[PDB]
A paper describes a structure:
Here we report crystal structures of one public and one private TCR (YLQ7 and RLQ3, respectively) from COVID-19 CPs in complex with HLA-A*02:01 and two S protein epitopes, corresponding to residues 269–277 (YLQPRTFLL; designated YLQ) and 1000–1008 (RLQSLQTYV; designated RLQ), that were found to elicit almost universal CD8+ T cell responses in HLA-A2*02:01+ CPs but not in healthy donors. Public TCRs are observed in multiple unrelated individuals, whereas private TCRs are distinct between individuals. For its part, the RLQ epitope, unlike YLQ, is conserved across human and zoonotic sarbecoviruses and is therefore a potential candidate for inclusion in a pan-sarbecovirus vaccine. The YLQ epitope has been identified as immunodominant in multiple independent studies, including one involving the BNT162b2 mRNA vaccine.
We determined the structures of the RLQ–HLA-A2 and YLQ–HLA-A2 complexes to 2.81 and 2.07 Å resolution, respectively. Clear and continuous electron density extending the entire length of both MHC-bound peptides allowed confident identification of all peptide atoms. Both RLQ–HLA-A2 and YLQ–HLA-A2 crystals contain two complex molecules in the asymmetric unit. The conformation of the RLQ peptide in the two RLQ–HLA-A2 complexes is nearly identical, with a root-mean-square difference (r.m.s.d.) of 0.14 Å for α-carbon atoms and 0.68 Å for all atoms. The RLQ and YLQ peptides are bound in conventional orientation with the side chains of P2 Leu and P9 Val/Leu accommodated in pockets B and F, respectively, of the peptide-binding groove. In the RLQ–HLA-A2 complex, the solvent-exposed side chains of P1 Arg, P4 Ser, P5 Leu, P6 Gln, and P8 Tyr project away from the peptide-binding groove and compose a moderately featured surface for potential interactions with TCR. In the unliganded RLQ–HLA-A2 structure, the RLQ epitope is not very prominent, which is reflected in the relatively small amount of peptide solvent-accessible surface (322 Å2) that TCR RLQ3 buries upon binding RLQ–HLA-A2. Of note, all 12 human and zoonotic betacoronavirus lineage B (SARS-like coronavirus, or sarbecovirus) sequences are fully conserved at the RLQ epitope site, whereas outside of that lineage, most alphacoronavirus and betacoronavirus sequences differ at 4–5 positions within the epitope site.
Author numbering:
A (entry chain B): 0 to 99
B (entry chain A): 1 to 274
C (entry chain C): 1 to 9
Write the structure that this text describes.
Amino acid sequence: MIQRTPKIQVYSRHPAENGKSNFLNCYVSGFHPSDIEVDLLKNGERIEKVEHSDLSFSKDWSFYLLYYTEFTPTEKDEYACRVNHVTLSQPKIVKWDRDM
Amino acid sequence: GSHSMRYFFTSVSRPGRGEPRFIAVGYVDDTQFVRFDSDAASQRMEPRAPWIEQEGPEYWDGETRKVKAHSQTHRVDLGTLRGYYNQSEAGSHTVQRMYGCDVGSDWRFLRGYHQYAYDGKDYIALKEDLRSWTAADMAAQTTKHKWEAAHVAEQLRAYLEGTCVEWLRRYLENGKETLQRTDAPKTHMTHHAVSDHEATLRCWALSFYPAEITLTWQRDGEDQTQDTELVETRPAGDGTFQKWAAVVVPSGQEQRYTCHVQHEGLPKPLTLRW
Amino acid sequence: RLQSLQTYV
């Protein structure tokens, strides 16, 4: 049985601009099996009201999911995506980079 | 350009926690239009795009019954495959099915496919002629002969070359203002020096549809894929997609490198410089 | 539109 680790990208729907509402995305892809846990973080604490894509998979059969929520960026706050999967011994945290 | 209608089936067994979970989704190009979750309260096929909503009640009742029937068959399959491999009832296993049709610019039948996977690895798949089977191991050989006696490929080909092209054409017309638009990407370039004498040239492509795109980094006008970083195309969440490509270079020499954008919504492929 | 045929591995 093959097991694959999720790739994680954290980014905004539109170019980030302080004080203007945007959408924070965290995209999980290329993982197997389907079971996964994804949380969006507002300065280390779990954000509420986060929705996610319907489960699907790519040509190589590995799954992808989009987790997203509406937020309003500032300059001091830190945003991150916390991912837990069977291939990870421990939840992985990927910080949001404004440029990426 | 070209278009596609594809369906995806997933069923995850959960020993000790009830029946297996079945999830099904349907796509038109890179636009999802239906979904079914066997664990939801709906217990019904659901719209996920605006243009599919106009289909009447006979449509939604029929799609619910069959996705319910395919639900249960893939439940049995997890037991059958467990027997084929002499696996124990304790572990969780995955079964996946994908099928669909492709049509060209004239919307005439171009390609069909019907595939099946167990635990993320190829198991059985319909060949390109839609008359023969590709089996991965000796357990899929049992399935192959089982489906040859049941004339399964012949009944799949009739659907993939008929029903699937015609209902894909119907969707394409009924959703022309969304499914037939072509969002040209918006391109800019970031700069983020790494190290004294090396610095990143990241080529950005934003807000394009469909998802297919090609980004390439060149040296003097000729490509160099030595220091090129390339992320997977990702959804922006509003129906469009994003992608970037990066490279490192020696400093003061940043303007021998060009980036080339290929997209269907671009009449001209774009070149960018700094 | 889904295909109606039910198949068993």
